């Protein structure tokens, strides 16, 4: 471990699902296809979100690899790859990552830093009428 930071516990990583979080200065979502630990911790966000709403779609085999059909967008990303099915309009950036012990860790080389956005957080309804 050199330059690779831990991202989240392999085990908090629900099986079929992945999550974005905040790693140093790039989101990364980290798809978790089974009970394993060979993980898919890639910066796969849509900017409509913020989240990784393209890494809770439809984790699947499309033809001999893991692919995952975005909900939205529909395109196919291969998790390892970052390609779109077939044209690359949409193609997302996928980082290398290492299993130490139980955590999951990627090799964080910065490409693209933007700054936090100011959105306002999310509003109770308070009841109306009893």
Known sequence: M???????????????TGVCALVE??????????????????????????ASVLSRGIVAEHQDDLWVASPLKKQHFRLYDGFCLEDGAYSVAAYDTQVTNGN?????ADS???????????????????
């Open 2 to 16: 050199s330059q690779w930071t831990t991202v989240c516990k392999l085990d908090d990583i629900l099986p079929g």
């Open 25 to 50: 200065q790039q989101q990364i979502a980290v798809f978790r296809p089974r009970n394993d630990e060979q993980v898919y911790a890639i910066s796969n966000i849509d900017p409509f979100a913020q």
């Open 104 to 108: 999951v860790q990627i090799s964080i």
């Open 112 to 130: 693209d830093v933007a700054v936090d956005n100011s959105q306002p957080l999310p509003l109770e309804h308070h009841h109306h009428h009893h």
